[PDB]
Amino acid sequence: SSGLVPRGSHMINAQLLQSMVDASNDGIVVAEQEGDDTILIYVNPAFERLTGYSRDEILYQDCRFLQGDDRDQLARARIRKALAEGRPCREVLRNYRKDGSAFWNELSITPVKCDADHRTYFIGIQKDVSRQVELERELAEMHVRRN
Amino acid sequence: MINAQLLQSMVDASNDGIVVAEQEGDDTILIYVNPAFERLTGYSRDEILYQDCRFLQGDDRDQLARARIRKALAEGRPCREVLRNYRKDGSAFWNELSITPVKCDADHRTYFIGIQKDVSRQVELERELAEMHV
Ligand SMILES: [Cl-]
Ligand SMILES: [Cl-]
């Protein structure tokens, strides 16, 4: 049974948390709900590196800027629903970079209530799946080629 | 310019494992672990914390890579490696591990941030593909 001793170092501080977020390989954004729209108030470097948009053209603009795919229209809709209800959700989407090139990404959204200011914020995690998708497709082709 | 609770939630929601470690003598001691790291390795936070990084069983095929990591850590340098590791239950996973040094002169010591991304599916798909060409 777990009678484990509770552990965590109280040496950890907000400076180290910011470095974890800066070092994260996945993109990490924070968003707020202003009326009917979703506004990005924080983005980490990975988000820039994956999407090609800078922090400053993104910040405090509606997230509609990241161009979606029509094959994802249903998933897009599931996301807005969960956002309105403050429920979490996860979806794999084909999105478009600033230069219009496509990337596949798994997007996972967690709502969080802030203790200092009582308002509801949502945390996105943006995982590039492009390489997994591309490998799975090559394998599918080779199955047609070989077998 | 961002709340300290919100950063923690960012780290907690992460899919990748995120740890902090500090050098202690000959050891690199893990002082923080996020939930994804618990799930990736199969160990709970309280069984991981304050143990040397070698608690997580490695592969003999990685001995060279581990040596590079030791060197980078001793020198306070970042490094990145793909390793085969084994969970608490003994199942294997491939993971890309990226280490970022951070100096706190406040603490008079260098902290290390690992990012541990499970690459297992990428590795096995790549291996299947290698066969299909034979
Ligand atoms: Cl739409
Ligand atoms: Cl494509």
Q: How far apart are CA B100 and CA A46, in angstroms?
A: 15
Mutate to test the interface with A, among B3, B10, B95, B115 (most CBs of A within 10 A): B10
Three-state secondary-structure class, residue B27: strand
Tell me the resolution in Å: 2.5
Rounded Cα gap, residues B28 and B70, in angstroms: 9
Is some CB atom of chain A closer than 8 A to the CB atom of B98? yes
Domains observed in chain A = 1-147 (3.30.450.20)
**Separation CA A46–CA A31 (nearest Å):** 16
Chain A residues in contact with B7 by the CB 8 A cut-off are 14, 17-18, 20-21
Residue count of chain A: 147
> Which ligand has the nearest atom to the CA of A80?
1
Contact list, A135 vs chain B (CB under 8 Å): 122, 125-126, 129
Q: How many CA atoms lie within 13 A of B117 on its CB side?
A: 17
CA-nearest of A22, A25, A18 to A128 is A25
Q: Are B31 and B22 in contact (CB under 8 A)?
A: yes
Query: Residues A98, A124, A127, B7: what is their CA dihedral angle, to the nearest 10 degrees?
Result: 110
Instruction: Say if CB A44 and CB A30 are below 8 A apart.
Output: no
Contact between chains at A25 and B98 (C-beta distance less than 8 A) = yes
Q: Half-sphere exposure of B113 toward its Cβ, with a 13 Å CA cutoff?
A: 22
User: Which of chain A's residues have a Cβ under 8 Å away from the Cβ of B4?
Assistant: 14, 17
Q: A92 forms bridges with which residues in the sheet?
A: A106
Alpha helices in B42-97 (DSSP H): 45-48, 63-74
